[PDB]
Symmetry: D2
Subunit: 107 residues, 4 copies
Amino acid sequence: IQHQFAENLSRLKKEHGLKNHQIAELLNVQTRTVAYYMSGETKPDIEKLIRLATYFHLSIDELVGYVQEVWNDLSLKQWLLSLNLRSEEEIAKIKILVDTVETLYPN
Amino acid sequence: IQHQFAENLSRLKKEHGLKNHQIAELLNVQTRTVAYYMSGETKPDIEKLIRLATYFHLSIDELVGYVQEVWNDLSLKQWLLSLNLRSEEEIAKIKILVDTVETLYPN
Amino acid sequence: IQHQFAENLSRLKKEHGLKNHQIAELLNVQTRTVAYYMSGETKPDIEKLIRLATYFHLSIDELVGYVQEVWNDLSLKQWLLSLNLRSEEEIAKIKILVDTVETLYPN
Amino acid sequence: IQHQFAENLSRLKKEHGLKNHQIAELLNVQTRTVAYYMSGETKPDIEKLIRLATYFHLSIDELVGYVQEVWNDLSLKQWLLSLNLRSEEEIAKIKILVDTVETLYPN
Ligand SMILES: [Cl-]
Ligand SMILES: [Cl-]
Ligand SMILES: [Cl-]
Ligand SMILES: [Cl-]
């Protein structure tokens, strides 16, 4: 239930051989602020989590240690999953179609 | 590259028939602050993103619209993936083993 | 690179306390055939993998130990990901829209 | 509930501008057999699904249109998720530790 951002950031720092001032430089904050991230005394805003997730190639969920725990109709989930087979050109067309219809006929 | 939290929160509000004050009550903030979330004028901290993701049953990545874009050795990835087959009782034992060894013999 | 279905099925059998004849009954095959699955001498067809994945609540990828290893434009991936926020009723409408247009105007 | 491998393979063939004989060459089967895959008259074995998923960069689940639908204790799931933060060198060590202990002291 409780996230573990401070523990995770501490382990990333260790495993990557980083110093707090290097992370501070990455996020444009004080080195002191990064110390407080690590100790859990203070937490970053969404923009800072995104910069860290991008740097370390992590999902935001992995970075903060967030985990969860139902579709009524599975053939819809199956259709949605099937969009991952489409080329980017075909997905681009579907996005225009759906955006257009939503603009013209707002639910 | 740019997240779309404000757009996503706005669509969740619409599709769920929520009023800003209901979301405000959920997060223990002012209704005005929720208005600013929706317009993108201000962003929530990690604790507020987690409360929203939990409420709407979403990953934090889905909630904010974060997307990314390599293992050197795939048999390790394959091993890690294989842990998802294990019972919770067996994963609990592995966690104790690994935590213990890390405590005794800190890399 | 090489899948590990036989190793995985063997570990599932062990961790669940199953006997080969119980798995055979699940798949409507001979107990001997299940023995050959476990030893890697023979592999199941897609229908049998789906029955096993469903029984054990696993992805087919997890069940067989399959792992992989690029979007040209990430805002499309981000849009696709955003569909996971939509209600089933709204996804159902999008599916009809897209299916209809594909039927009328086949790429 | 019902997979959609034949529909998916048909759409991949279309979107990629492939001919059946090209897919046949990829899988080392007759062109006729690929025709039967597409019409759903016959299904490939796991080795052939893996070759297709690898070629098209898809999960096996995406390729066949398989979808599913609980952890008792979430802090274990959270620990397992946290392994994705580790370097490959550290995961390699954990794998040796766990494999060794399993070999010495078989549950
Ligand atoms: Cl600062
Ligand atoms: Cl407030
Ligand atoms: Cl049989
Ligand atoms: Cl053949």
